[PDB]
């Protein structure tokens, strides 16, 4: 199933090299994972902790930090930046 990232999210995804306007959820999660990893936003010691308070990701998610363990929260934050395609 396809999703359409809203503009700030799409800009983030494009900043890692993605070129599409329409993605599967798995693609969105893949590119967002690469973004977090390459910008080194994760905690060195507990690498499920992500710090986004001085990053585009923080504006997008509306939080200063989160843990990868917070699955529902991550999806909630993602889905606010996407439209599901009919």
């Amino acid at each position: 199933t396809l999703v359409r990232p809203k503009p700030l999210l799409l800009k983030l995804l494009k900043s890692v090299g993605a070129q599409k306007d329409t993605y599967t959820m798995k693609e969105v999660l893949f590119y967002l994972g690469q973004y977090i990893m390459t910008k080194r936003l994760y905690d060195e010691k507990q690498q499920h902790i992500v710090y986004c308070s001085n990053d585009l990701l923080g504006d997008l998610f509306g939080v200063p930090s989160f843990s990868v363990k917070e699955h529902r929260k991550i999806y909630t934050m993602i889905y606010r930046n996407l439209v599901v395609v009919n």
């Binding site: 798995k26 994972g33 690498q47 499920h48 990868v68 699955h71």
Partner: peptide
């Protein structure tokens, strides 16, 4: 686990 391994866990369940 590294961040990419945590990432990969989440992604795989999508």
């Amino acid at each position: 686990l590294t961040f990419x391994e945590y990432x990969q866990l989440x992604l795989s369940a999508a």
